[PDB]
Structure 1
């Protein structure tokens, strides 16, 4: 598969918005995560974000936090996630971006994620003190360090972020952005456009949005990619069984692929 940056560039030259599913590795088990990764690919996922469970995933929404807890109770570890990727990556046509909080990786060299076929890395709580050391190490291993920005980061720092980021710029929020009459809040349109104004990099938007009309609107407001997380993790990991999870995940993902096209 291609780097994340190349995959994104190509969609943007074509006027197309990337479909970026997010699932948590190990929920409900790693054999099911493998099969999910292959199904997501076959439904036309452009990039897949894959979460490594940790004991405090405080930047994630509650659906994803509950999935992370389930993945830690299935005894899932960084090493077991890398072993699975090493088998599954050669079969996927699209790149994987690993998401992990900083403490589990603070002790790694990133040599073993590269070897396992990971292309990108997202460290949501990356320390300001460590961000350059990790960028350098990711570079030295041929991995792209994808950075978050949020509506809380002032404009001048947001610009420094966009410059340092690789693969795409990832715009997220810990705050919900849809209202009680089930509309996307209009301030989201400005939030995406503030970041597009300062960079030529692909801006991918992870705001917790799952309905096909809503996903279409985030695209139409200029996102280059839409990360669909909570709703994918629900379909897969809140089902009656792994088999039903996968059937539900495929139907949902086809519908999101259709919406975004």
Structure 2
């Protein structure tokens, strides 16, 4: 299976960028999260980025910190997340699914065992938030042995030696965070034959999706705007889904350039 390659092949023949929502698994409950994900796909998400609740997400802002607490309140554990992932993949065979992990959950029961379980449940890519490229060797080697794409963040303060490593070590897509001009970052990444770059910094409005695609990125990740719709609408679950549906379909229409 190479869902990312297929996805990007189809998107390019129809002059589209990818829209990718992020959502924490089990927020605000297991059954409602499964509803949220089926709503996001139905409204036009091209791929999914899914977080596993972790006690100490030092790379995340407050919207995501609260998403994790909501999921912990619901009793969500890693094992339940992996149960949820199998259901999602059974319902949606072609959508790429990427996990956003913290290293301790990957390390806990064995690095290889973790990526073996991802390949069993049909995950396509894993980003480990607190593993820089300099420490990544055991993680990406385990990922590649189990046919999992290892994803790396290219930050705004990236120098050239980082660009060269990200381009060589990453697969699936390159996670782009926004001193260096943006369109030449996409340029250097295409120079170095990096996996297609998705822009993931502060993507809140249809105009930002359009800007990313026109700037050269293959698409955009909305890393927290979706969790905010969940937060605002916690009391009315049916308004939560309708607001998610309208937002996602707006954001995805924006990707058709």
**Is the counterpart of residue 228 in structure 1 residue 222 in structure 2?**
yes
Following TM superposition, by how much is the alpha carbon of 1:191 offset from its aligned partner in structure 2, in angstroms?
Answer: 4.3
Q: Which residue of 2 aligns with 1:100?
A: 101
Taking the aligned partners of 2:208 and 2:236, their CA distance within structure 1 comes to 29
Alignment of 1:74-223 (within 5 A): 74-92=74-92, 93-107=94-108, 108=110, 109=113, 110-128=115-133, 130-172=135-177, 187-223=181-217
Following TM superposition, by how much is the alpha carbon of 1:189 offset from its aligned partner in structure 2, in angstroms?
Answer: 4.2
Following TM superposition, by how much is the alpha carbon of 1:11 offset from its aligned partner in structure 2, in angstroms?
Answer: 2.3
- What's the Cα RMSD here? 2.3
Following TM superposition, by how much is the alpha carbon of 1:130 offset from its aligned partner in structure 2, in angstroms?
Answer: 4.3
Q: Which residue of 2 aligns with 1:49?
A: 49
Following TM superposition, by how much is the alpha carbon of 1:254 offset from its aligned partner in structure 2, in angstroms?
Answer: 0.9
Q: Which residue of 1 aligns with 2:242?
A: 247
Name the SS for the 2:129 alignment partner.
coil
Q: Indicate if the aligned counterparts of 2:126 and 2:149 stay in contact, CA closer than 8 A.
A: yes
Q: Indicate if the aligned counterparts of 1:159 and 1:199 stay in contact, CA closer than 8 A.
A: no
Taking the aligned partners of 1:121 and 1:55, their CA distance within structure 2 comes to 19
The change in CA–CA distance for 1:151 and 1:127 in structure 2 (over 3 A counts) is closer
Name the SS for the 2:5 alignment partner.
helix
Following TM superposition, by how much is the alpha carbon of 1:30 offset from its aligned partner in structure 2, in angstroms?
Answer: 1.6
Deviates more, 1:203-212 or 1:5-14: 5-14
Name the SS for the 1:97 alignment partner.
strand
The change in CA–CA distance for 1:86 and 1:2 in structure 2 (over 3 A counts) is same
Taking the aligned partners of 1:140 and 1:197, their CA distance within structure 2 comes to 27
Taking the aligned partners of 1:130 and 1:189, their CA distance within structure 2 comes to 28
Taking the aligned partners of 1:237 and 1:2, their CA distance within structure 2 comes to 33
Following TM superposition, by how much is the alpha carbon of 1:212 offset from its aligned partner in structure 2, in angstroms?
Answer: 1.1
For structure 2, list consecutive stretches of 5 or more residues without a partner in the other structure.
none
Taking structure 2 as the reference length, what is the TM-score of the superposition? Answer: 0.88
The change in CA–CA distance for 1:63 and 1:190 in structure 2 (over 3 A counts) is farther
**Is the counterpart of residue 258 in structure 1 residue 253 in structure 2?**
yes
Q: Which residue of 2 aligns with 1:20?
A: 20
Name the SS for the 2:152 alignment partner.
strand
More helix by share: 2
Runs of 4+ in 1 over 6 A off after TM superposition: none
Q: Indicate if the aligned counterparts of 2:43 and 2:248 stay in contact, CA closer than 8 A.
A: yes
The change in CA–CA distance for 1:190 and 1:70 in structure 2 (over 3 A counts) is farther
Deviates more, 1:229-238 or 1:46-55: 229-238
Taking the aligned partners of 1:52 and 1:75, their CA distance within structure 2 comes to 12
**Is the counterpart of residue 69 in structure 1 residue 64 in structure 2?**
no
